[PDB]
Amino acid sequence: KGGAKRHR
Amino acid sequence: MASMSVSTASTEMSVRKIAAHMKSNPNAKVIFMVGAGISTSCGIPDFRSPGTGLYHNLARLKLPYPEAVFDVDFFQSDPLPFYTLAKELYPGNFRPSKFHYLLKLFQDKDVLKRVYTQNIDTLERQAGVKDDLIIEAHGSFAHCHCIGCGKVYPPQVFKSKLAEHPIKDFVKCDVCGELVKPAIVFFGEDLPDSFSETWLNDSEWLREKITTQQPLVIVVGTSLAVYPFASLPEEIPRKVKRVLCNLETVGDFKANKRPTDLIVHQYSDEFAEQLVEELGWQEDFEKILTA
Ligand SMILES: NC(=O)c1ccc[n+]([C@@H]2CC(COP(=O)(O)OP(=O)(O)OC[C@H]3O[C@@H](n4cnc5c(N)ncnc54)[C@H](O)[C@@H]3O)[C@@H](O)[C@H]2O)c1
Ligand SMILES: [Cl-]
Ligand SMILES: [Zn+2]
């Protein structure tokens, strides 16, 4: 689903 | 509400191409992907910017760095910074921009397929955009939930605490006792299921249009530095025209430019003004603004 909210 | 161009250069010609694409494809719809840039004209204070009352209040409260206000671990250790930010940014404290109303206009003209937003101000919804056409990728204050057991809470309980002086005795779950917080996606948390599910459907929608009219995806006011939202642009079909209205070329538009990519360095409100003019909907637009 894209993973957790982050800057990476 | 008044706007002006970012530089001496005119963007009217580039904007005109967009209007031309729509004129040629009268039965096509547009998908918008937007960020904080479209709400700057609304006066929403940037928590990351010094010189903003919010930034300094958070600093005074010992917040280690801006984004710690959207960190679950920090929140659990000290919820005051987040409550303080909530008090200042709570929906209803601001009014939609000219660009937000442009979305409403497109909806009225039935040319709006969807608007994916990273903003938590919910100004798209406040402006009248229908729930079915909005994807609030980073959540909103419309719902509250216990970070421990997930019990649902009406948003009013949390909101009522924001009007107290000082803000204390934060909302705790009456089942497991953990902190209750607005359904805002914090860094480190997954986005709501509706995000990926809807993009899955709109992705198929985009591709099947390439083989019929020709859709259009417009990215506006985002630095495309926050994932997974930032992954959307690159996932747009190669054959679907991408438009970027941002003060700077960013993300995939910078890393992997496409021949048909149309970059428009312009303020979102000025962009909206110029697009309505080229589309010939000044009359209807003026009506919405005066509504
Ligand atoms: N209204 C809000 O919900 C809000 C407000 C402030 C910060 N944020 C943070 C922003 C954020 C997502 O990054 P994002 O959307 O990319 O923010 P961003 O602040 O990183 O970037 C906004 C981008 O838009 C550009 N920009 C600023 N004003 C305008 C304008 N008038 N017209 C056109 N372009 C403009 C600018 O070049 C910048 O790249 C999250 O991590 C939030 O926590 C959200
Ligand atoms: Cl492809
Ligand atoms: Zn609970």
Q: Which helix (H) or strand (E) holds B75?
A: helix B72-77
In this structure, what token pair is assigned to residue B176? 């497991």
Does the beta-carbon distance from B193 to A2 stay under 8 Å? no
Q: Which of B138, B188, B190 sits opposite A1 (nearest CB)?
A: B190
Helix boundaries (H) for B128-251: 155-161, 193-210
- Cβ B102 vs Cβ B124: under 8 Å: no
In this structure, what token pair is assigned to residue B177? 């006792």
> What is the strand order of the sheet B139-146 is part of?
B152-153, B139-146, B180-184
- Cβ B265 vs Cβ B6: under 8 Å: yes
Q: Which helix (H) or strand (E) holds B219?
A: strand B216-220
B195 touches chain A (CB under 8 A): yes
Q: Which of A1, A5, A8 sits opposite B185 (nearest CB)?
A: A5
- Quote the CA–CA distance of B126 and B122 in Å, as a whole number: 6
**What sign results for the dihedral spanned by CA atoms B199, B201, B207, B210?**
negative
DSSP letters spanning B102-150? HHHHHHHTT-EEEEEE--SS-HHHHTT--GGGEEETTEEEEEEEETTT-
Max CA-CA distance within chain B? 60
Q: How far apart are the first and last CA of chain B?
A: 14
Q: Is the CB of B40 under 6 A from ligand 1?
A: yes
Q: Which of residues 1-8 of A touch B (CB under 8 A)?
A: 1-8
- Cβ B109 vs Cβ B129: under 8 Å: no
Q: How far is the CA of B283 from the centre of ligand 3 (A)?
A: 51
Task: For chain B, list the domains and their CATH numbers.
Answer: 1-40+97-137+193-291 (3.40.50.1220), 41-96+138-192 (3.30.1600.10)
* Experimentally determined by: X-ray
- Quote the CA–CA distance of B64 and B11 in Å, as a whole number: 41
What resolution (Å)?
A: 1.8
In this structure, what token pair is assigned to residue B241? 């025209």
Please return the burial class of B196, using the count of CB atoms within 10 Å of its CB with bins 0-12, 13-18 and 19+: middle
Mapping DSSP to helix (H, G, I), strand (E, B) and coil, where does residue B162 land?
coil
